[PDB]
Amino acid sequence: ITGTSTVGVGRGVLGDQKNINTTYSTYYYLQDNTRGNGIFTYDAKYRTTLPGSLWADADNQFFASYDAPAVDAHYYAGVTYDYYKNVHNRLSYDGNNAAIRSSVHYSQGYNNAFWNGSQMVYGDGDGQTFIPLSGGIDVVAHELTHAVTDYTAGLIYQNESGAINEAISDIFGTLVEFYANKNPDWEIGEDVYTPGISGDSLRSMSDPAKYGDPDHYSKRYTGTQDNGGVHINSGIINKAAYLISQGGTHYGVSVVGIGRDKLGKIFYRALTQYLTPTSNFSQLRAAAVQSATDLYGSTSQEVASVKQAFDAVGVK
Ligand SMILES: CC(C)C[C@H](NP(=O)(O)CNC(=O)OCc1ccccc1)C(=O)N[C@H](C(=O)O)C(C)C
Ligand SMILES: [Ca+2]
Ligand SMILES: [Ca+2]
Ligand SMILES: [Ca+2]
Ligand SMILES: [Ca+2]
Ligand SMILES: [Zn+2]
Secondary structure, eight states: OOOEEEEEEEEOTTSOEEEEEEEEESEEESEETTSTTOEEEEEOTTSOSSSOEEOEESSSEEOSGGGHHHHHHHHHHHHHHHHHHHHHOOOTTTSSOOOEEEEEEESSSOOOEEEOSSSEEEEOOOSSSBSOGGGOHHHHHHHHHHHHHHHTTOOOSSHHHHHHHHHHHHHHHHHHHHHHTSSOOSEESTTTBOTTSTTOOSEESSOGGGGTOOSSGGGOOOSSHHHHHTTTTHHHHHHHHHHHHHOEEETTEEEOOOOHHHHHHHHHHIIIIIOOTTOOHHHHHHHHHHHHHHHHOTTSHHHHHHHHHHHHTTOO
């Protein structure tokens, strides 16, 4: 909407206070004009029609329980925009400052979040499996990264290309979590998953097997559930990424870690310059090796470490 840029204040899903960029015109709207062509947050009102209504508030204060998922979707979309711009020189998900839209309060007891081709969508959870999913910065960045992938590599959402698609969202979700630097880790969704159980998460990149996912190509799922295991086989690539960054010895194969920033550079380049809609795991290895070669040189430690990591997870 047309109005003047303002700054509201509220509390997120985890009870933390934060400032949010809003727009004033009669009401204060969750419309952040400070980033690209805007970040817009909508209320789906427990229904499934999208996007719903642009979030409007009478007083620019967002401390109601109902407000919390909107505060976090809006704010974490901002952090994710900043990560892509500042770290990768990418302007929004399309590279041309496309407006970023999110809807919260989607459906009832909805234990998921997604990118629907046009916008991000967040359930509130059922209160047992999840609390409102926008409360996780890794979750918000995971979802926005699906948009980046769709605009770039275009990885088809099934089988190996789909597992790469998923891993890319977990990798950048995690790198954004480290960028914001609040309780960062290599787990996915820990801030919003199972409020009654401490110390767990939806997936682990450092040890995918902890939550039942493969950490070696020999253990890949080849059935039809989950679009051919896109959230399962992602563990193989997540493990490789973790090893590239942090190092380790995995099934007897030692990897020298090169750190998160270089992991991010290598995978961002692979995603945007080398991967295609049908890339498989072997092709991702080749894309990552070439990306590291471009950035650091063929004889670099960075290239050697990428090879070691894919060796460790059984991807040739
Ligand atoms: C980071 C997570 C908290 C959320 C994450 N959601 P996602 O974006 O991967 C769900 N994907 C999804 O709905 O794709 C289907 C689709 C939806 C709309 C248009 C095209 C394709 C996830 O891992 N979801 C899991 C799954 O869908 O298996 C669930 C179990 C949480
Ligand atoms: Ca208010
Ligand atoms: Ca964390
Ligand atoms: Ca995390
Ligand atoms: Ca938990
Ligand atoms: Zn996903």
